Design a protein around this ligand. Structure first.
Ligand code: HEM
Ligand code: NAG
Ligand code: MAN
Ligand code: MAN
Ligand code: MAN
Ligand code: MAN
Ligand code: MG
Length: 208
């Protein structure tokens, strides 16, 4: 993904994100991928605990899932998994101590949704990730530091639908097979707005 961020304003929410991703012509993944963040107003000076995220992920004959690692590597990092079923986008907060099926994250992080969309080729989500930037699971603790002006992030996409797709806590996954990477997601001032609190208040949907 690009390290230097693009800037994007979602029309309906009015939320402005820094974004990074891969185009549909990228050889690194099929169908493109985009991730973005909006942060608390002082995030570039003081480490935030939360963000509002944007995900745009690909579908392969209307199947597949995508994921972000908030720490970079698959392991020892809070993981966000996302996938569509019918007209709903689900997420699951996950954590892996090794290169195997990630477990449900045991910490207090919580995702709420602002909006989502599903069509035949893509799905997208805008979501608030509360208490997501510092994590603790099974004695492993870590976090990301917005005040450093960069987030080390990982992404994956996959072609198969998760098993039990209507139950985030019980999903099963195959090893992702539609690209992966770790990159430096550089942040600029567009990523932090006085409007953050108003924007976060739009995240009123809890998708169970
Ligand atoms: C049963 C499900 C899963 C299996 C078996 C699995 C397995 C693996 C394996 C073996 C690698 C190393 C590939 C290589 O080095 O070439 C890897 C890389 C990665 N995986 Fe997973 N994975 C699974 C689910 C996830 C989920 C849910 C996420 C995040 C939402 C994730 C994030 C990553 C990332 C970011 C990398 C690249 C960085 C790294 O090597 O640590 N994976 N995966
Ligand atoms: C399909 O939905 C995605 C959601 O992000 C959107 O970006 C894309 O333009 C849509 N395509 C069509 C043909 O409607
Ligand atoms: C962020 O967004 C809020 C709500 O849309 C605006 O009122 C404000 O000017 C800031 O740019
Ligand atoms: C959300 O709430 C904060 C309070 O910290 C305001 O300062 C901001 O303008 C937004 O309305
Ligand atoms: C919280 O807020 C949105 C509108 O901002 C509602 O449409 C949604 O159903 C939830 O109640
Ligand atoms: C949906 O429900 C969760 C708890 O189930 C709340 O924390 C959230 O703010 C939204 O109301
Ligand atoms: Mg920077």
């Amino acid at each position: 993904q690009n390290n230097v961020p693009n800037t994007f304003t979602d029309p309906d929410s009015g939320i402005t994100f820094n974004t990074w991703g891969l185009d549909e012509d990228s050889p690194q993944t099929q169908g493109g991928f985009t991730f973005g963040v909006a942060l608390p107003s002082d995030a570039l000076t003081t480490d935030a605990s939360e963000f509002i995220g944007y995900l745009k992920c690909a579908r392969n004959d209307e199947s597949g899932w995508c994921g972000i690692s908030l720490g970079g590597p698959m392991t020892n990092s809070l993981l966000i998994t996302a996938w569509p079923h019918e007209d709903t986008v689900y997420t699951s907060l996950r954590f892996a101590t090794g290169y195997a099926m990630p477990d449900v994250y045991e910490g207090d992080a919580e995702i709420t949704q602002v909006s989502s969309s599903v069509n035949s080729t893509h799905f997208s989500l805008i979501f608030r990730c509360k208490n997501c930037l510092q994590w603790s699971h099974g004695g492993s603790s870590g976090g990301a530091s917005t005040s450093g002006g960069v987030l080390v992030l990982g992404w994956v996409q996959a072609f198969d639908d998760p098993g039990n797709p209507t139950c985030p806590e019980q999903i099963t996954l195959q090893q992702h097979d539609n690209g992966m990477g770790i990159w430096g997601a550089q942040l600029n001032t567009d990523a932090a707005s006085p409007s953050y609190t108003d924007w976060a208040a739009q995240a009123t949907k809890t998708v169970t």
